[PDB]
Amino acid sequence: HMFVKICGIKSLEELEIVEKHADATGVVVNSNSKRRIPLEKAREIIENSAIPVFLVSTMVGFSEWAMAIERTGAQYIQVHSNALPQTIDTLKKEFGVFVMKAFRVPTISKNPEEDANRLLSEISRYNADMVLLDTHDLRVSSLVARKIPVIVAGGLNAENVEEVIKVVKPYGVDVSSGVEKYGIKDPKLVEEFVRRAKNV
């Protein structure tokens, strides 16, 4: 129905919270991010999780990816970088990882239909198992989502998730800050977000 991923957890405690209701989670490594964690903490979250844990990074290099996967035992990766199609393809073959690749959508778009078609050719260049679209304008997202399964992310929360889902009609949604309080995932926000998203 509606895949819900809660991204950017930093502790086994946060894992337990998201594991209750979410379909997937993610740990940020080797990125300029407030959510970044050491490889040992990533390893702990991955080994203890009952749901897919995406290893999320802005790493570009085939070999830094390989080493991160080996060091963490990740079976799911989320690539937010210009890592080449060839790198993504080789990581899949060598490691059997499921690959989600992130693509930026415009904040504003002059012609939505053409921006969607442009991102779609950009997407067909990589051989990713899932597309994540990073978000104002939801029109481009709507039209990409109609052509291919996508997870949509960017500024989602309980107050806007239901509307975003109605417009975009994605395969799933991804949230981080929207379900947080003081930089820690909030059990009541998590439960509410997932419930509302699952209802549309």
UniProtKB/Swiss-Prot annotation:
Pathway listed: Amino-acid biosynthesis; L-tryptophan biosynthesis; L-tryptophan from chorismate: step 3/5
MF annotations from Gene Ontology: phosphoribosylanthranilate isomerase activity
Domain of life, per lineage: Archaea
Catalytic activity: N-(5-phospho-beta-D-ribosyl)anthranilate = 1-(2-carboxyphenylamino)-1-deoxy-D-ribulose 5-phosphate
Gene coding for it: trpF
HAMAP family xrefs: PRAI
InterPro entries in alphabetical order: Aldolase_TIM, PRAI_dom, RibuloseP-bd_barrel, TrpF_fam
Organism annotation: Pyrococcus furiosus (strain ATCC 43587 / DSM 3638 / JCM 8422 / Vc1)
Protein name, entry field: N-(5'-phosphoribosyl)anthranilate isomerase
Keyword annotations of the record: Amino-acid biosynthesis, Aromatic amino acid biosynthesis, Isomerase, Tryptophan biosynthesis
NCBIfam families: PRK01222.2-4
EC number: 5.3.1.24
Top enzyme category: isomerase
BP term (GO), one: L-tryptophan biosynthetic process
CDD domains: PRAI
Record bears the keyword Transport: no
Record keyword Amino-acid biosynthesis present: yes
Pfam families given in the database record: PRAI
